[PDB]
Design a protein around this ligand. Sequence first.
Ligand code: HEC
Ligand code: HEC
Ligand code: HEC
Ligand code: HEC
Ligand code: HEC
Ligand code: HEC
Ligand code: HEC
Ligand code: HEC
Ligand code: HEC
Ligand code: HEC
Ligand SMILES: [Ca+2]
Ligand SMILES: [Ca+2]
Ligand SMILES: [Y+2]
Ligand SMILES: [Y+2]
Ligand SMILES: [Y+2]
Ligand SMILES: [Y+2]
Ligand SMILES: [Y+2]
Ligand SMILES: [Y+2]
Ligand SMILES: [Y+2]
Lengths: 471, 471
Amino acid sequence: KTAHSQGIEGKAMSEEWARYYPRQFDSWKKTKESDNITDMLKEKPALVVAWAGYPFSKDYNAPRGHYYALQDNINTLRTGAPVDGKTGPLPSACWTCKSPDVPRIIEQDGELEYFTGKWAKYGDEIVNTIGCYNCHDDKSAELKSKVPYLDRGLSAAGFKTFAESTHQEKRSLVCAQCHVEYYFKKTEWKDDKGVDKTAMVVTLPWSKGISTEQMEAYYDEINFADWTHGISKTPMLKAQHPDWELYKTGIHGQKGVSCADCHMPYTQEGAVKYSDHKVGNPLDNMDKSCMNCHRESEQKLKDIVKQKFERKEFLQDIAFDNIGKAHLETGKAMELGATDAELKEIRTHIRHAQWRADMAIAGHGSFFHAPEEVLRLLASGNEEAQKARIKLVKVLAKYGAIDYVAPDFETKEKAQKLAKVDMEAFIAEKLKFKQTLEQEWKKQAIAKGRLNPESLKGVDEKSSYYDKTKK
Amino acid sequence: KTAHSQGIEGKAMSEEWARYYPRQFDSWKKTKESDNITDMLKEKPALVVAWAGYPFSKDYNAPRGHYYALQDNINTLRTGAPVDGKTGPLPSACWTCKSPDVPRIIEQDGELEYFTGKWAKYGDEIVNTIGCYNCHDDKSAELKSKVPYLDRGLSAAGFKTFAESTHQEKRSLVCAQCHVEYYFKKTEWKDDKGVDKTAMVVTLPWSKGISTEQMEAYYDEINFADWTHGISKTPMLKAQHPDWELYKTGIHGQKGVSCADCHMPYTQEGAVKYSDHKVGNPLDNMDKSCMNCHRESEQKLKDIVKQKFERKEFLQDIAFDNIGKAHLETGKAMELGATDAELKEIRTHIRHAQWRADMAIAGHGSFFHAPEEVLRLLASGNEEAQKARIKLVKVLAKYGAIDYVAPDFETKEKAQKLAKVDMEAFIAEKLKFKQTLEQEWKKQAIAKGRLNPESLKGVDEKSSYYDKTKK
Ligand code: HEC
Ligand code: HEC
Ligand code: HEC
Ligand code: HEC
Ligand code: HEC
Ligand code: HEC
Ligand code: HEC
Ligand code: HEC
Ligand code: HEC
Ligand code: HEC
Ligand SMILES: [Ca+2]
Ligand SMILES: [Ca+2]
Ligand SMILES: [Y+2]
Ligand SMILES: [Y+2]
Ligand SMILES: [Y+2]
Ligand SMILES: [Y+2]
Ligand SMILES: [Y+2]
Ligand SMILES: [Y+2]
Ligand SMILES: [Y+2]
């Protein structure tokens, strides 16, 4: 048994586990070191055109340390600027994979109630970032999945549930609670007091399997769309960090190497043996993350990984350039009078092209986890995009614009202009929110004893729109 | 020293080495077991359209056992039907990588003289198939490169020559004498007797490096073209088995694993240790070819290799379908009056699209040797093809054929019709050649003591146009 077999008071605050596990706590807090903010819209402006009409066209950055998960969720322009617990653009489900307070609230008020309402609803309750309680039982300290949608997805796909999986499988599944692709399923229900409510439930699109094509069939079957494209009016699908799905069928995944083997390698200091909890870039310490299984040179392995990234970049830029042009050319055809019937096939191609390309790039480590599937997906997506463009030439020609040249979107500024994103307004409104309601959330959370000031150190120094220099 | 330190009389006939190396000779002759003839034009008819106007549109089969190299060189419709030593469509260089008689003749008459004249020139001299003398010194038995163009290519690319390479590197370079991409360089010269002659010299396009793009730049720089496309009139480049080039930068190649490690694995019978000379499919005996370095399941490894082949197939069919359509659409534009100036950019795209796609598929093991580069190449080639097709829509529209639908080529028969290949005539003419001049070549070679009847056992049972049932 553990030294806390009856549980841990205040379990949602990771600091509460420190007295029992100083090593794991100290390494866990070190993800604070990964504070870089890479603005993906700035690096890949084609993404702005791809996501026109959707929140990702406003703000989208690369992943950084777990230490910043909650604050980034608050800072992203995607969550907008609520003025109370009933306003703001996004639902409560947006907190789900950012805090140990989520399982706390779910175990308290239930899954449906948790998924009901606005993101702003839990502003002064969900205040701790990815912690011990997201992956560990507070009595046995054993690995556990705290989100019901994971098992439901696993079962639907023909996989064993978390409880029925091997220990090695669990070392990856704890990550899969969050590092997977999902969608929100509008779910109607009624609470104990007889009140009819509507929940937006996190759902893994795995009922037909976890391949990109199977998920595609899943979404098409239910005629689902995350949004109607702002330029092409195509019914779009948004892929979000399908890290586990892509990893699962990559060679390491097929071999049984777990996320933890590379990202949380075992370490030994003296006679002390434990798992490095500083989840980050495995290449930072290859002797612990790679050289236990590989006998070659570290530099050679790093050069190989770099090559994989370069291949992905090559195909990514091609696919999204054609996807972007397709969206714009469809928008031009629309302006000229093209009917929905004339654009149906084209829009279907675009929907599929971007779903495949986004699934390939949304998982930031996929270029390494599953290189070959990533390249195949980008090639497949590009082909669908070009099929759409070949057809668009004919539609444009019919309306007298065969020589139309889709506008360029090589800078974030130009792309957001094409996507009609009023950044100045969004940023101004966001800053107001941060200076008022956000501070009230934190003040109240601290007053109630749900949040310890210590955890906020250097947590709000950067975002894609401001930089106090370094988080 | 060896038991034949002064050399081997009749060294070009591998049977002559049997008295010294029975083990290697016995395994070497077993490639006779790999007699399957896979008609690639039948399996992938899109290749016929791709090679319209070129010999490969007539006959192109997958590689089989070394035992059949010489006979297949004779049987392929590509070498046609000469009536004497001064006729036939192809040059003497076509024997180069098919027989140990090649180095014999080169060391005798010199490289330029060997590369001068028709393929038919050496019909009764080059009669032994890939043998000991192609890779071994007949005095020391040490590995050697017998073709001067390999070192010239290696040096041009910044690589060490064969003599300066490590033993492990030589275990791959002996294969590279033949398993590489090349082109024929028209070379003018004058013999000792003062006669001006023209040679077609095998040349490795490596002066800018061995990557597909570098070779592409090499060919474009010298404005080279293997042939003018029969349908699109595009200046085409033909890629031929760039096995080593693609392997070199694949992970096994980067790690230093040699061709021999997988294709000629070390074997031990009792106290006897030797290299398995039955060059074939490593998957036939993974315990010798893979399991010495891999600790997983053989079935799992095989399933992974199968997956790689499926990914390659997926992209290959897409790329060649668009390449085929591009050729046909260009031919249609030509029929309508499109000028060379109007088609220049399109033809450049087609040339590059097919060069990249052909480089990706011409090496039959590349899907495994360098999976990621193969997928990237097929994706790149397809993109160039689609760029050509988008432009072709506009050219076709200008001439009133915007709704033109390129004809289908899903069967070898339909494709060869589009490529205007008179198979009946070619096969009839070939059979006549085989029944007359070929038999005379063999009868004379046997009479002169250059060929032993033993080596012909079951060697001429199959081809892509006849099957006595099984070679
Ligand atoms: C949900 C509760 C999560 C669990 C469980 C795990 N991760 Fe995570 N991860 C999550 C978020 C929201 C983020 C973004 C943080 C931000 O503010 O940007 C991440 C980020 C990572 C990263 C990036 C690290 C870096 O760039 O420095 C990695 C490498 C990563 N996550 C891996 C990972 C692994 C291996 C997990 C299981 C052991 C794991 N995460 C669990 C959310 C959640
Ligand atoms: C779990 C199933 C998740 C849900 C539901 C949402 N997010 Fe998430 N988010 C998750 C992970 C594993 C990651 C890291 C890996 C990656 O590819 O990003 C993230 C990251 C973020 C970030 C930081 C990166 C960025 O996009 O700027 C933000 C700002 C973020 N997530 C916001 C967010 C919102 C608003 C959500 C509701 C729509 C949401 N996430 C849901 C996992 C999960
Ligand atoms: C999920 C993303 C995790 C978070 C957040 C934390 N831990 Fe963890 N922990 C995780 C894994 C995958 C593992 C390895 C499990 C295995 O047996 O292979 C661990 C392990 C531990 C252990 C056991 C001893 C060890 O291997 O180090 C302890 C005691 C532990 N973790 C404690 C702990 C604490 C205190 C955390 C919060 C600060 C914490 N973990 C977060 C995954 C995750
Ligand atoms: C070792 C063989 C690994 C396994 C198994 C997994 N990951 Fe990984 N991951 C690894 C590398 C070398 C890299 C590239 C360098 C980097 O840190 O980016 C990655 C990357 C990621 C990322 C992207 C992080 C970022 O761009 O900021 C994420 C989010 C990530 N890995 C998550 C992750 C998960 C959840 C895994 C199991 C499903 C997983 N990785 C396995 C190496 C290895
Ligand atoms: C052991 C548990 C492993 C860890 C930790 C890492 N890798 Fe690995 N890797 C492992 C296996 C079993 C395999 C498959 C080959 C085999 O022996 O069966 C691999 C393969 C690779 C490859 C080749 C795959 C490819 O390039 O497409 C690379 C380049 C590779 N591994 C890199 C790598 C790096 C950088 C790691 C640390 C972050 C790493 N591996 C960890 C087993 C294990
Ligand atoms: C030129 C003299 C060659 C040398 C040296 C090597 N190979 Fe070869 N190989 C060559 C030809 C002309 C052919 C085609 C034979 C035919 O009649 O179709 C081949 C074929 C192979 C194959 C196919 C085996 C099969 O399908 O059963 C393989 C696997 C192959 N060659 C590999 C290979 C290796 C590893 C070499 C070096 C040790 C090697 N070849 C040398 C011509 C020549
Ligand atoms: C070495 C540099 C070569 C030259 C010059 C030529 N060939 Fe070849 N050939 C070579 C190899 C390594 C292979 C096997 C691998 C592969 O991808 O095929 C081959 C194979 C053939 C075959 C059998 C397969 C087929 O195409 O049907 C034939 C019939 C063949 N080669 C004919 C041939 C001709 C006519 C040449 C002159 C233009 C020629 N080869 C040159 C290596 C080399
Ligand atoms: C090139 C394609 C080869 C042909 C044709 C033949 N051999 Fe070979 N042989 C080759 C390699 C790559 C190797 C391994 C070299 C190393 O040291 O790693 C060998 C080796 C031999 C040896 C040495 C002992 C052994 O490893 O088995 C002998 C005595 C030998 N080869 C003999 C031999 C004979 C008699 C051949 C014709 C029948 C023959 N080899 C063809 C490559 C090639
Ligand atoms: C092991 C890691 C290998 C190395 C190193 C090389 N090859 Fe290979 N090759 C290997 C496999 C598993 C396969 C696929 C199965 C098959 O036999 O086709 C191949 C295939 C080839 C082929 C294609 C043969 C055919 O389709 O008939 C050729 C011509 C071939 N390999 C040649 C070859 C050469 C010359 C190498 C070094 C440059 C080489 N291979 C390395 C496994 C391995
Ligand atoms: C040792 C000399 C090897 C032989 C023989 C074969 N492989 Fe290999 N393989 C080896 C290394 C060093 C690596 C790179 C990973 C690492 O540990 O550094 C690999 C990798 C693979 C992979 C992963 C690459 C990928 O999938 O993209 C596969 C699938 C693989 N090897 C398969 C394989 C097969 C089928 C072999 C026999 C024909 C084979 N390998 C031989 C080392 C060696
Ligand atoms: Ca989604
Ligand atoms: Ca060539
Ligand atoms: Y406490
Ligand atoms: Y990062
Ligand atoms: Y130890
Ligand atoms: Y003799
Ligand atoms: Y074969
Ligand atoms: Y042994
Ligand atoms: Y790979």
